[PDB]
């Protein structure tokens, strides 16, 4: 169509410049990767995951049954950093609840050991996890890179990692967080709120109409007071600049 790179390329960065903050979003279509935004070296930078982990996580749980999808993890009475995770909930509930509760007591079901084999077996990010099972993803020393995120999120749109299809079926189902005119986003936010400095993320792909997948990664330093949905926002905005939704 008739609009420039150069404009499309200026427009997309400006969304950074706005929010005042440095960042990356990485758009995949087919094989080729193209990298958007106002800091474009942060793409082949590692970083934590945070909360993107969840997709991983949820995998690993139910391959190898350590949860179901219609279990309901009780919230144990205890006062909770946010207080809608003071609630009981299913692993889609805590999905977009990023209910990091939940998803530290399925890391426990999970077990370290069984945790690094899936890990490597899936060869996410640098691998590494450590010895504590259930804060690896948050405060290292596992690491990843916003080209790995969307070569991650581009293999589950597919169907494509070493898992049964049922298994990535149901997670799939449990990233769905916006439609817009026929076309759907499946996607997880991240936030290493345990990190200097601290990363942001929006990990997913965009389902079209006509049933084309386009993942993508955003990737971005969380600064002072932002709303996490500047993640969600600027991600919006820049996938309509480039008419993919
Ligand atoms: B996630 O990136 O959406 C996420 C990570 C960490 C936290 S947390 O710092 O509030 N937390 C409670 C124990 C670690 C929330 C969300
Ligand atoms: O995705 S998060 O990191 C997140 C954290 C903070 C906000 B906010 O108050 O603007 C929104 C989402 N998360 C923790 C609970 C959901």
Redesign the pocket.
Known sequence: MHISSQQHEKAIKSYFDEAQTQGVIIIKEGKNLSTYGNALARANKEYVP??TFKMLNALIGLENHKATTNEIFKWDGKKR??P??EKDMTLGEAMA????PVYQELARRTGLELMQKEVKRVNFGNTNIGTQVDNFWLVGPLKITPVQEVNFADDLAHNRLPFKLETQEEVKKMLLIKEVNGSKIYAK???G?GVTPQVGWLTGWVEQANGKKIPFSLNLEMKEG????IRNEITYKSLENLGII
């Open positions: 945070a909360s950093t946010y809608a995770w609840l990023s209910a990091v936010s991240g936030w709120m932002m709303s996490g949905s």
